[PDB]
Enzyme design. Structure first.
Site, mmCIF file in Angstrom:
data_model
loop_
_atom_site.group_PDB
_atom_site.id
_atom_site.type_symbol
_atom_site.label_atom_id
_atom_site.label_comp_id
_atom_site.label_asym_id
_atom_site.label_seq_id
_atom_site.Cartn_x
_atom_site.Cartn_y
_atom_site.Cartn_z
ATOM 1 N N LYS C 10 0.624 -69.320 0.645
ATOM 2 C CA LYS C 10 -0.267 -69.379 -0.527
ATOM 3 C C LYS C 10 0.576 -69.079 -1.779
ATOM 4 C CE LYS C 10 -4.780 -69.593 -0.454
ATOM 5 N NZ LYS C 10 -5.354 -70.802 0.200
ATOM 6 N N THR C 57 -3.471 -69.931 5.223
ATOM 7 C CA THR C 57 -2.996 -69.469 3.920
ATOM 8 C C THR C 57 -4.074 -68.643 3.217
ATOM 9 O OG1 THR C 57 -3.684 -71.386 2.565
ATOM 10 C CG2 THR C 57 -1.653 -71.596 3.731
ATOM 11 N N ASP C 58 -5.340 -68.957 3.543
ATOM 12 C CA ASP C 58 -6.416 -68.118 3.018
ATOM 13 C C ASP C 58 -6.295 -66.685 3.495
ATOM 14 O OD1 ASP C 58 -9.175 -68.203 1.578
ATOM 15 O OD2 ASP C 58 -9.538 -67.032 3.408
ATOM 16 N N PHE C 159 31.890 -71.861 -32.081
ATOM 17 C CA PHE C 159 32.250 -72.790 -31.033
ATOM 18 C C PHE C 159 33.293 -73.769 -31.568
ATOM 19 C CE2 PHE C 159 31.482 -76.276 -27.858
ATOM 20 C CZ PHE C 159 31.949 -75.533 -26.762
ATOM 21 N N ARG C 176 27.551 -70.366 -36.540
ATOM 22 C CA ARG C 176 26.369 -71.147 -36.189
ATOM 23 C C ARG C 176 25.277 -70.178 -35.716
ATOM 24 N NH1 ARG C 176 27.595 -73.785 -30.114
ATOM 25 N NH2 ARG C 176 27.723 -71.758 -29.153
ATOM 26 N N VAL C 227 28.704 -69.666 -25.293
ATOM 27 C CA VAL C 227 27.668 -69.095 -24.414
ATOM 28 C C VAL C 227 28.321 -68.590 -23.138
ATOM 29 C CG1 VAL C 227 25.571 -69.638 -23.114
ATOM 30 C CG2 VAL C 227 25.833 -70.498 -25.420
ATOM 31 N N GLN C 228 29.228 -69.397 -22.611
ATOM 32 C CA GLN C 228 29.993 -69.007 -21.416
ATOM 33 C C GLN C 228 30.553 -67.616 -21.467
ATOM 34 O OE1 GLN C 228 29.865 -71.983 -22.968
ATOM 35 N NE2 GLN C 228 30.369 -73.699 -21.561
ATOM 36 N N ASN C 254 21.223 -73.524 -24.506
ATOM 37 C CA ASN C 254 21.573 -73.400 -25.928
ATOM 38 C C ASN C 254 20.584 -74.235 -26.737
ATOM 39 O OD1 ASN C 254 22.931 -72.981 -28.346
ATOM 40 N ND2 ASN C 254 24.895 -73.666 -27.556
ATOM 41 N N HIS C 256 19.424 -75.653 -29.713
ATOM 42 C CA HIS C 256 20.156 -75.971 -30.935
ATOM 43 C C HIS C 256 19.297 -75.930 -32.206
ATOM 44 C CE1 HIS C 256 23.251 -77.253 -28.125
ATOM 45 N NE2 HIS C 256 22.540 -78.237 -27.654
HETATM 46 O O1 LIG Z 1 -4.243 -77.773 6.111
HETATM 47 C C1 LIG Z 1 -4.332 -76.581 5.943
HETATM 48 N N1 LIG Z 1 -3.265 -75.809 6.346
HETATM 49 C C2 LIG Z 1 -3.138 -74.453 6.271
HETATM 50 O O2 LIG Z 1 -2.128 -73.889 6.611
HETATM 51 C C3 LIG Z 1 -4.292 -73.817 5.667
HETATM 52 N N2 LIG Z 1 -4.488 -72.537 5.485
HETATM 53 C C4 LIG Z 1 -5.687 -72.527 4.901
HETATM 54 O O3 LIG Z 1 -6.222 -71.477 4.530
HETATM 55 N N3 LIG Z 1 -6.292 -73.745 4.731
HETATM 56 C C5 LIG Z 1 -5.346 -74.617 5.226
HETATM 57 N N4 LIG Z 1 -5.423 -75.944 5.384
HETATM 58 O O1 LIG Z 2 28.653 -72.289 -26.428
HETATM 59 C C1 LIG Z 2 28.689 -73.491 -26.314
HETATM 60 N N1 LIG Z 2 29.157 -73.995 -25.121
HETATM 61 C C2 LIG Z 2 29.301 -75.303 -24.765
HETATM 62 O O2 LIG Z 2 29.675 -75.625 -23.664
HETATM 63 C C3 LIG Z 2 28.873 -76.216 -25.806
HETATM 64 N N2 LIG Z 2 28.916 -77.522 -25.783
HETATM 65 C C4 LIG Z 2 28.407 -77.831 -26.976
HETATM 66 O O3 LIG Z 2 28.244 -79.003 -27.332
HETATM 67 N N3 LIG Z 2 28.070 -76.778 -27.786
HETATM 68 C C5 LIG Z 2 28.363 -75.690 -26.993
HETATM 69 N N4 LIG Z 2 28.303 -74.387 -27.292
#
Ligand SMILES: O=c1[nH]c(=O)c2[nH]c(=O)[nH]c2[nH]1
Ligand SMILES: O=c1[nH]c(=O)c2[nH]c(=O)[nH]c2[nH]1
Ligand SMILES: O=c1[nH]c(=O)c2[nH]c(=O)[nH]c2[nH]1
Ligand SMILES: O=c1[nH]c(=O)c2[nH]c(=O)[nH]c2[nH]1
Ligand code: NA
Ligand code: NA
Ligand code: NA
Ligand code: NA
Lengths: 295, 295, 295, 295
Positions: C10, C57-58, C159, C176, C227-228, C254, C256
């Site tokens: 779920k 899942t219920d 940069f 920048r 950034v790296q 980034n 821009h």
């Molecule tokens: O097709 C279903 N699978 C499940 O595993 C599930 N569990 C559930 O609550 N309803 C459903 N329906």
């Molecule tokens: O910090 C930056 N890293 C990049 O790799 C990059 N490439 C880019 O066009 N601008 C920037 N600025």
């Protein structure tokens, strides 16, 4: 101080409904997100801790599910009208209900070229929406829309002849990309109530279909002078095709695709006529809006 | 301290390319988001401020656009292989290139039932992706995938017979909704280099088509005993249909749709056989994964 | 075909817990999002529709809530270890539990300069996370991290000295902006089981505090060559300060901020030394990664 | 058909500005997202492909950067007023400018307990915003707001006494969690133009500070009868503290935290007085709104 306006309710209520045809085995699904906000004589809940006037939002949620159980959820214009009417009729002190519905796509799958009776695919995030305002003694005001319809044309868009002054750097162009996300709204004439809405039910799906058809065809076929000019042509046609619409609204971003000059690298030619690789721009974007009514 | 691993480059590089047919007027567009991360003898850029070993990420960006200008960008497996090969061949001290490509959908529009020569629609957020790892002296390792394929079936899903103990409340069911977002990966046998990748170019589009076809048909047609059992059937078939694939991976959320008991309201029946209105749950969600290889 | 790997459970399980001090009135809250995926002898659930081996899942969801009720949820390294140990001990056929926890910030409010006993503010989307892998017969492997820590320095980033060839257009700079979203992970030596994790409980909060302190101070004070080089200095110090850590990983975009040449407008000077207004770029972005271990 | 309304411009314009103190070395940064939409005699750009009336949105973008270079960008109410005034004064045929500004947080870092002269941290996604509507012959209408202020209180929230009917299932409670995302707007009396805005410049930062202070203190200290009642108290106080404000608007989701009944498991007690572990609900959510004016 005093309350000048107030509305409250439940937002983001997710709703699924299935229709099953016993005779054919064919199932059909609908999925929505619903918001209902109420107005009325509720100011004392704000000013005097008087919760007696509050229809709990949890109860609004329950009512959304119950209404969906007892009524068609399509077309969303109808469902929203039924839902909003409920609140103003059931509660004397509630005088307006504001119903927003976002409809999500579940399109039937084609498997080995035949429609499948109960499997569906979300063929995009395009939404069909309604805003239904049900106001006691003032009928039902409906705005219908499509949104999130994302399109691109690779040529037959232009933009030249615009104002040029000391703030201008943009070059005129006679051939550019145009891409947008379409937000298109059609506003219905006021309905006096639920009966009148019901009298027009088939027109809701048909007018949505028209709006979408006109949008796509006009976008594809208009050798566009600008976003302004193209959107206006769409609006014009929709008004011509459904007399019960009063206005048509478009809100369109211009999602820019910039040329990339690569001539600095081995004299590579990638502009103008030789433009093949472009840089889609996430922001900024033009935003173009208009509301078109009848002359 | 010492550098145990290091990779660096440019992410979220948006790329559009258009192909124009002079003779027919038919244009075709491709749009992608590209990430390239390099490894090699670059540790001194981290430990000794030695930038001489850095191929600037800005230059990696330029190279992505230039490579797209001078080569086909489809299929993405090929483009990524060309791009990654470039870095390890051009720079003696760079020994691996990690190329991730997300391909965005631009499907040609049909207007009045005929394909339009230069207008396109984004028919969903479903993506086609590649992860291409180009490693000097160790060839080219490619993983291909589809993701964001959102589906629902309204019946013919079951889940019963699971373990029950003091932590269990879930009821067995013989008829439920199943909805998921498909993330499916097929891992290619190692290629010795770009020549070998090129020798197989038609298989990339065909295997993506198979994977998507098998996914959809198996989802639609399997009366599913569980997500586990259904996904395994998909994987099995894909392996059977393309011998150059070594493994198939699926990662599937179970996006729950809960029944809503409305019997508290006027004895309304909306469970079991009478279930029509459900509450889609945004979270939590089951998450089911497997990697399937050949026996 | 055969299952080569499988895990299931779920995801997106939201959890809140409150502690209330009866004697002082002071309440303390914790909020998390939890994912638990299990491995074991479960392959027949995929290949033979054998759900007997599935812990639903219920039920996994229920167990998460129950474990949180009966144990401290802080530090998240401890909680995840307790939770994962539960599954492998309770179920003979389950041999690993993969527990991911995202901790959300709820910082106590200061009101009129005094800490409030039960009101909290989300002072950013910065998260504190753990990945706890509990593997039967192989102890407990923990990775701890902070993510979404968004910072900017307006000078004292450089940069220059990077490789220049026919793909290079970037100008060298000696002053920048540098802005990033910090993703920093510290990997603990293997623990033999829950007892050993418990023997070190105070070190988890202290090492997170050190990691965050070192990150911020090094970012603020390093006249950065890239950034790296800056990220490596952070990693070095964290390893020096906690001997139970084996490796430190950083993943830094980034983000821009581009100068804007306005000299075309009335000879306005906004570059170099006169740069005051910049255009933050949403994409693309540099992505810089390293894993640092001990010499 | 005819144009009933139209506005157009550039959205999502990201802007950074730095101020450097030569004498002290102390740098200060501002970051915003700006939208400018213009109205005026532009209908022929929509109806007759007459682009001569269009101030290109690209030029609007340039103008935003130039204005930021030549004027203070703080307080945003002032900057927006200067910017909007520019368009209506510079272009005879443009009669309104709609300026929306979202201000992003860059809070100066404290390193070893002293403020750092050029390093900053984004201490949340909380925004400070303005909507500045500059309308020729009708002055300057400003709405100021804070949004994305996310808070939680673990007790001293109640909700009882609400309407109960056949749609109601919610239990009354005298002790619950309350969590929201605060969206608070204060609407200024109309200003006749830029001179009047300038005459009030210090009041903009002070009123934002008051709004935020009142929000937080009232949330922390009000033993809340409902969201309605608590928000009204906030609005009341803000109006009392700044006479140049006409109205105060709040829009507050109730982000529900549900109890979890665990008594089915070993008789575990986790409700009412014994409630310690809760399930935060992503959706649905209450949505509560009001606009408060002076009596
Ligand atoms: O097709 C279903 N699978 C499940 O595993 C599930 N569990 C559930 O609550 N309803 C459903 N329906
Ligand atoms: O910090 C930056 N890293 C990049 O790799 C990059 N490439 C880019 O066009 N601008 C920037 N600025
Ligand atoms: O169709 C367009 N309309 C505009 O208003 C505009 N402004 C601009 O810069 N490009 C465009 N394109
Ligand atoms: O403060 C609240 N107001 C409401 O209007 C409401 N409705 C609801 O269901 N819970 C709450 N809580
Ligand atoms: Na009424
Ligand atoms: Na090399
Ligand atoms: Na076990
Ligand atoms: Na004017």
């Amino acid at each position: 101080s005093a309350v000048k306006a107030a509305r409250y309710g439940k937002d983001n209520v997710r709703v699924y409904k299935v229709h099953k045809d016993e005779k054919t085995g064919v199932q059909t699904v609908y999925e929505m997100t619903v918001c209902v906000l109420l107005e009325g004589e509720i100011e004392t809940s704000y000013t005097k801790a008087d919760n007696s006037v509050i229809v709990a939002t949890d109860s609004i949620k329950n009512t959304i599910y119950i209404t969906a159980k007892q009524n068609p959820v399509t077309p969303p214009e109808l469902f929203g009208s039924i839902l909003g009417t409920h609140f103003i009729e059931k509660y004397n002190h509630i005088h307006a209900a504001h119903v927003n519905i976002v409809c999500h796509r579940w399109t039937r799958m084609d498997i080995d070229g035949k429609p499948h009776p109960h499997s569906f695919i979300r063929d995009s995030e395009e939404k069909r929406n309604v805003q239904v305002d049900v106001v006691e003694g003032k009928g039902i005001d409906i705005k219908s829309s499509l949104s999130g319809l994302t399109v691109l044309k690779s040529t037959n868009s232009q933009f030249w002849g615009f104002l040029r002054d000391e703030y201008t750097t943009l070059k005129e162009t006679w051939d550019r990309i145009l891409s947008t996300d379409v937000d298109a709204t059609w506003q219905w004439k006021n309905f006096s109530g639920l009966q009148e809405v019901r009298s027009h039910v088939p027109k809701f799906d048909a007018t949505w279909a028209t709006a979408r058809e006109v949008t796509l065809k006009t976008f594809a076929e208009d050798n566009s002078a600008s976003v302004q000019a193209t959107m206006y042509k769409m609006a014009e046609q929709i008004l011509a095709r459904q007399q019960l619409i009063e206005t048509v609204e478009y809100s369109l971003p211009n999602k820019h695709y910039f040329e990339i000059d690569l001539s600095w690298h081995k004299g590579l030619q990638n502009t103008g006529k030789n433009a093949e690789v472009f840089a889609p721009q996430s922001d900024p974007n033009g935003l173009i809006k208009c509301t078109v009514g009848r002359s």
